[PDB]
Structures are given as C-alpha cells and as structure tokens.
C-alpha cells in the first residue's frame, strides 16, 4: 500500500464489477450478498477504531473476555447492517474526485459521486482515510452523507443504557440484534 487513491479506485471498481456480474446469483437468493461483502470490502476497513469510538469513557474499567465478545459481536452487527443497507441497486455509474498530491499528512478526506439520469439527481457520499502511525498503511473507518454522520448518532443515542444496565447488557443487546 502507498497512495490511498489507488486503493480507493481499485477496490471501488472491483467491488462494483463483482456486484454487477454476479447479480443474477443475487436474484437467485437474497440471503447471500453478506459473504461477498465480508470477503472483498471488509479486509480493507478497520474495526478497533469503530468500537473504540462508540464505547468511550468506560475503558479504564474493562474486562478482557468481555471486550473480546464485544469486539466479536460488533463485526456481526456491522456486516449485517451494512449488507442490509446494500440493497438499493437499480443501476448507476460512479466518478472520483480530482486527484491532488500532498503527502505530509495523516488524516485526509476524499470524495466520490454516483449518478443515474432517468430517476433522480445524484448524491454526494464521502469517506475518511487515515494513515497508520505504525507502518504508514492507510485505512478508513467513518462515513458521512450530506452533513449527517454514522458514528456520532450511535455515540449520542446509546448513552445511559450502558451507564446502568452494564457492558454485558450491551453485549446481549447486540447479540439479540445479530438476528433481524
């Protein structure tokens, strides 16, 4: 890995193509895209920052095996929700932002866009790529859409619930959400 734009472009085009060509197989069964999502896209993202940001505060007090089971169920929740969100295909093309070199940075935002003429005007998705402090391996974690986040709400809603019921309470809750 080196220039994050390379990884972004290549992974995006490969994912779009792998979606498009195997779409008849998706029409064969709707309980199947999750394995492809976890096979191609997941190896490129990061996990620890997601749980680390959503948890917050309650980390000086922590139980090892409890953290293990939490990090476990977290990825099942995430994959299920993201695969459920995937189900919006109809056919539309993509475009990337104009390249701009820099280098001496760690946190760097980029943009993408998708468009379809016959139906509705385009939208504006984003991402958040982060340079690692250990080996320079760039990596992403967040996602933003027209001024709304996807981590801020999960940090703002699941509040007192943790403060009272218990970490294992949230673990059992997630384990329940693992099936929808």
């Amino acid at each position: 890995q080196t220039n994050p734009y390379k990884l972004m472009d290549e992974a995006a085009q490969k994912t779009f193509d792998r979606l498009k060509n195997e779409q008849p197989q998706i029409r064969a069964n709707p309980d199947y895209l999750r394995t492809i999502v976890d096979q191609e896209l997941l190896p490129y993202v990061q996990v620890k920052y997601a749980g680390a940001l959503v948890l917050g505060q309650y980390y000086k007090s922590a139980t090892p095996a409890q953290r293990e089971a939490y990090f476990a169920a977290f990825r099942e929740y995430l994959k299920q929700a993201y695969g459920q969100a995937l189900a919006m295909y109809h056919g539309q093309t993509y475009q990337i932002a104009p390249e701009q070199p820099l280098g001496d940075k760690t946190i760097v935002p980029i943009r993408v866009t998708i468009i379809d003429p016959n139906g509705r005007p385009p939208v504006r998705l984003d991402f958040q790529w982060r340079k690692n402090s250990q080996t320079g391996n760039w990596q992403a974690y967040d996602m933003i859409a027209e001024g709304v986040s996807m981590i801020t709400t999960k940090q703002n809603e699941w509040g007192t619930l943790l403060r009272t019921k218990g970490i294992d309470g949230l673990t059992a809750q997630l384990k329940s959400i693992s099936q929808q």
């Binding site: 680390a52 940001l53 948890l55 917050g56 505060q57 980390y59 000086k60 946190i107 139906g119 509705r120 005007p121 939208v123 958040q128 402090s133 933003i144 027209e146 001024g147 709304v148 986040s149 801020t152 940090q155």
Partner: protein, 116 residues
C-alpha cells in the same frame, strides 16, 4: 484566568459568527478566539480557546456545528474523546491542534433531495 488556545481547520463556516461559546456536554466553557482565511488553498481557519481547569480530554475528541431552538442562534459543540492505552494517547498541550472534524449543513439540499 489562565486560558490556552488551539487551532482547527474546517470546510464550511455556515454562518458561525466570530466570538461565540463552545459547549461540552451542555455547559459553556470557553469562547472562540477568531476566524480567518488561507492564502494557499482558499479554506477557512478557526482559532479557539479553553479554560485550564478541564485539562485531560484525550486527543481523539471531536467538534461539530449545530443550531439551538428552532431558529435562534447557532453554536459549536465539542464531543469528549476516547482514552487510549498502548495506542495513540497525547494529552492536548498548548500550541497543538485538534484533528478530524465535521461540516455544517444547509436546508436547501435536503428540501431538494426530498422531492423527486
């Protein structure tokens, strides 16, 4: 009282007049110092200040912009960070700068995207 200042970039001020109060969990700590523009990439830059008693917020906090009431004034709200052993830590010392941010929003985009 002994205050200390920090620097942060953005993307859209969105009507945030200079000199306004920050907020951390609902209470007002300090005000924002000043705003200006960049002569190399055309982006705004904002310097803010903070009172010294609170002094342990871990680095990877967050900032955000929002509006109170329904149409009163609008301010910016801080979000306390997650403490990190082993990995990146760093108590915020004077003369540093906060990292990843977020951008404001305008109603017209939503109104337009709601009616297709």
């Amino acid at each position: 009282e002994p205050t200390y200042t920090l620097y942060a970039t953005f993307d859209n001020i969105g009507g945030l007049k200079a000199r306004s109060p920050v907020s951390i969990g609902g209470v007002v700590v300090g005000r924002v110092a000043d705003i200006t523009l960049d002569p190399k990439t055309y982006l705004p830059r904002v310097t803010l200040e903070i009172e010294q008693r609170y002094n342990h917020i871990p680095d990877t906090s967050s900032l955000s912009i929002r509006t109170s009431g329904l149409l009163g004034e609008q301010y910016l709200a801080l979000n306390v960070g997650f403490e990190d052993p082993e990995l990146g830590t760093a108590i915020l010392k004077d003369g540093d700068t906060i990292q990843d941010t977020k951008s404001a929003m305008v109603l017209e985009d939503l109104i337009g995207q709601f009616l297709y």
